[PDB]
Amino acid sequence: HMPAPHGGILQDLIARDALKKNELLSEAQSSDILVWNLTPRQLCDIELILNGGFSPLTGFLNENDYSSVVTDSRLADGTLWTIPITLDVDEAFANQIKPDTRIALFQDDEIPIAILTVQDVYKPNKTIEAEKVFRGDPEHPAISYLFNVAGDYYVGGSLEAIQLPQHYDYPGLRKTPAQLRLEFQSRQWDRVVAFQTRNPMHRAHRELTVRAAREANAKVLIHPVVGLTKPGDIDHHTRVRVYQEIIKRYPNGIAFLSLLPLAMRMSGDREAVWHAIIRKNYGASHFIVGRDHAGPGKNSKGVDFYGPYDAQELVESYKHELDIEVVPFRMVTYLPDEDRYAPIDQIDTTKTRTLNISGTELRRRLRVGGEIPEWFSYPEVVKILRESNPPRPKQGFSIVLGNSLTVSREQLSIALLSTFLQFGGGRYYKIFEHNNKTELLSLIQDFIGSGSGLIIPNQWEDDKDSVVGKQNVYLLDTSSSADIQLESADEPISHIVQKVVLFLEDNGFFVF
């Protein structure tokens, strides 16, 4: 039952180029070879290629495959493939390469990853890519990256592997497709259903998953993404701690945890098919496709990027060709009087109690510090989330003295500092003078991340608002754009202080 890789053969480049390692290593570490440092998304991508995770890929797509993928969701030879995997480069580097040029791809400017043999260098129409691949919405994460982070030139080419990107965390937890397939054989695991996730798992996830295992007669592979998920989500370290904990809530010998160095595009539809392909290469006969699978969410005008079922239908439409089975996850609700989750479909809310916790409410219960029902998520998991996302009483913040203020900045700072220290509780306070220095402005969010309260005497230049981070940063000024608005610019310091103290207290930072 274990699926053959996509395209019939596991492109384990690490294993195929084993004997030539030192040979490739040297060439890569020679001063005669042109060097290109891989960006974060590229590092995740290249790992899956050398890995065989992106079978049948063997390098970054050339214009021929890239175009076929963009317009037909297939490689030039017809193989289903929905996400363009290209090596984006800038004009400068582009002008130093031509077909057959040998490039060395490094990590952190010092670790030899692989040797790339160019065969194509083109300047893709990002308008068409954004439209045909990511549905053209300018706010879509992939399209934003496409235009502001991705180089404007793609470099098609074949790769020869030196070593997979270096990782120092979760060793042996990042099993390659070959290792996973071998692990499944050790356990005599025939049928395996894989679960995609870039989020923490709660009881519902544990139940829906065990259910899939039961109905599909397969074992469970919890395959969390730890490379790059949606921008601004929970760090993977925290998620992995949650996974390692929830894995213990499954009957013994039913589930296995393994991390996927994937860099998502949040391209729902196509991404789902891409996900099915990837797990297939990793050895899964079944793939769970959730509601709005890999969906960013809603845009500015509240419009959804993808339809709630777009992903499940797309994968379902290609499953026979992919030779995998799709396990659709229907929306579910909790029935208190039975202590069980059930498909919304079969519930008459008119004659049955139902409980549900939205992501917003959860984010709120972690901000406020309120209890989280044990039926929604396991105790151990909630504790883990509580540590990473502390309630406002344990959160850091920053109070910036507006430019409109005329009071003694030094005195107001001393006054605020002295005042905050009366409340105590654990938070460390500091009058922070940056002097419009980037080396110091870059530390603001670090102190806030540490729960520290910073009193900042002056504002920084607008051409640096990007160096800081708006999170928990409040402006004290007379302007209508301030978070703490003073009626005048020459108010008594005690007047000003009280306004700030009560503001913070109202926002939950101080508790008495």
Active-site annotation, residues? 197-199
SS3 250: coil
39 makes contact, choosing from Na ion, its own copies, none, with CB < 5 to 8 Å by partner type, with Na ion
Binding track over 143-182 against its own copies, x by CB under 8 A: --------------------------xxxx--x---x---
In this complex, which beta carbon is closest to its own copies, that of residue 239 or of residue 270?
239
Choices 103-111, 184-192, 325-333, 473-481 (CB under 8 A): range interacting with its own copies:
184-192
Q: Does 309 bind its own copies (CB under 8 A)?
A: no
From 6-14, 17-25, 186-194, 325-333, span contacting its own copies (CB under 8 A): 186-194
Residues in 26-45 that interact with Na ion by CB under 5 A: 39-41
CA distance 5 to 59: 16
Q: b/e string for 30-57 if b means 16 or more Cβ within 10 A? A: eeeeeebebbebbbbbbbbbbbbbbbbb
Is 183 near its own copies (CB under 8 A)? yes
Q: Which is nearer to its own copies, 164 or 412 (CB)?
A: 164
Of the candidates 399, 456, 388, 395, which has an alpha carbon nearest to the alpha carbon of residue 427? 395
Q: Which of 343, 346, 388, 339 is nearest to 367 (CA)?
A: 388
103/113 with CB nearer its own copies: 113
Residues binding its own copies: what is the number (CB under 8 A)?
12
The reply to whether 356 sits in an annotated binding site is no
292 labelled ligand-binding = yes
Q: What tokens does 463 get?
A: 């051409």
41 binds, among its own copies, Na ion, none (CB under 5 to 8 A by kind): Na ion
| CA pair distance 156, 256, nearest whole angstrom | 36
In Å, what is the CA distance from 371 to each residue of 201, 202, 207, 374, 391? 17, 15, 22, 9, 11
Selection from Na ion, its own copies, none that 172 binds (CB < 5 to 8 A by kind) is its own copies
Residue 459 DSSP code: P
DSSP bridge pairs for 153: 89
**400 labeled part of a ligand binding site:** no
Is position 253 an interface residue for its own copies (rule: CB under 8 A)? Answer: yes
In degrees, rounded to 5, the angle at the alpha carbon of residue 373 between the alpha carbons of residues 394 and 370 is 25
Binds 232: which of its own copies, Na ion, none (CB < 5-8 Å by kind): none
251 binds its own copies (CB under 8 A): no
Which parts of 255-284 interact with its own copies (CB under 8 A)?
256
**Closer CB to its own copies, residue 247 or residue 489?**
247
Say whether 293 counts as a known binding-site residue: yes
Nearer to its own copies, 64 or 163 (CB): 163
Residue 345 marked as a ligand binder = no
| 255 belongs to an annotated ligand binding site | no
199 annotated ligand-binding residue: yes
β 102-107/111-122 pair status? antiparallel
At residue 222, the 3 state secondary structure works out as strand
Using CA atoms, how far apart are residues 304 and 296, in angstroms rounded to an integer?
8
For the CB of residue 184, give the shortest distance to its own copies in the complex, in Å.
9
The dihedral sign for the CA sequence 309, 310, 311, 317? positive
Q: Does 298 bind its own copies (CB under 8 A)?
A: no
Q: How many CB atoms are closer than 10 A to CB 484?
A: 17
Tokens of 484: 């703490």
Ligand-binding annotation for 196, yes or no, is yes
Q: Which is nearer to Na ion, 46 or 103 (CB)?
A: 46
172 CB-contact burial (10 Å; exposed 0-12 / middle 13-18 / buried 19+): exposed
Give the annotated binding-site residues for ATP. 196-199, 290-293, 332
Residues that bind Na ion (CB under 5 A): 39-41
Give the annotated binding-site residues. 196-199, 290-294, 332
Residues that bind its own copies (CB under 8 A): 169-172, 175, 179, 183, 186-188, 253, 256
